[PDB]
Amino acid sequence: APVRSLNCTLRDSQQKSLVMSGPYELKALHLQGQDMEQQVVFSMSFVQGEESNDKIPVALGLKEKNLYLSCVLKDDKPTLQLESVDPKNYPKKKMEKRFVFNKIEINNKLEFESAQFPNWYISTSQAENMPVFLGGTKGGQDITDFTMQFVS
Numbered sequence: 276a277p278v279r280s281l282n283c284t285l286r287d288s289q290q291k292s293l294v295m296s297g298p299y300e301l302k303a304l305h306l307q308g309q310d311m312e313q314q315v316v317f318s319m320s321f322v323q324g325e326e327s328n329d330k331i332p333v334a335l336g337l338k339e340k341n342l343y344l345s346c347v348l349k350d351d352k353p354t355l356q357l358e359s360v361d362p363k364n365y366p367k368k369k370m371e372k373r374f375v376f377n378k379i380e381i382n383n384k385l386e387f388e389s390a391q392f393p394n395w396y397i398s399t400s401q402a403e404n405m406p407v408f409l410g411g412t413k414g415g416q417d418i419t420d421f422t423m424q425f426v427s
């Protein structure tokens with residue numbers, strides 16, 4: 276049948292919100308009150324892929340935008356990009372592998388591992404106003420843990 280999707284926001288484990296940083300990048304800021312209108316609303320789609328109790332393959336689209344987080348090699352490195360797609364064809368159940376993240380639940384937090392690049396994770400910096408990126412460490416100074424908020 277149709278792919279199933281949920282609207283949501285994400286915040287890193289230091290409670291930074293995610294906002295746009297130009298058309299094809301996200302950044303992480305400490306936000307509260309009126310400025311949380313700036314927060315990215317995701318459509319999280321539950322897609323085809325290897326699955327277990329605590330590890331669920333998803334795509335992360337921007338709500339009602341033909342833009343998806345994707346993992347590609349750039350200048351020879353696994354990177355996070357925002358990629359445009361044909362809005363007639365997305366979302367779909369069989370998303371291409373660069374769009375797939377394994378959403379992993381550990382100790383009441385979520386990590387998003389690249390399905391394409393094992394042990395590379397959606398990451399933020401400790402500093403404010405820095406890009407969201409793909410990080411090859413889920414253990415160090417960079418933040419790889421998130422919480423989800425469900426949106427109407």
Ligand SMILES: OC[C@H]1CN(Cc2ccccc2)CCO1
Binds near residue numbers: 316317
């Ligand atoms: O508050 C002014 C901004 C907030 N908006 C976040 C946003 C981005 C993508 C999908 C849903 C929502 C972007 C355009 O307007």
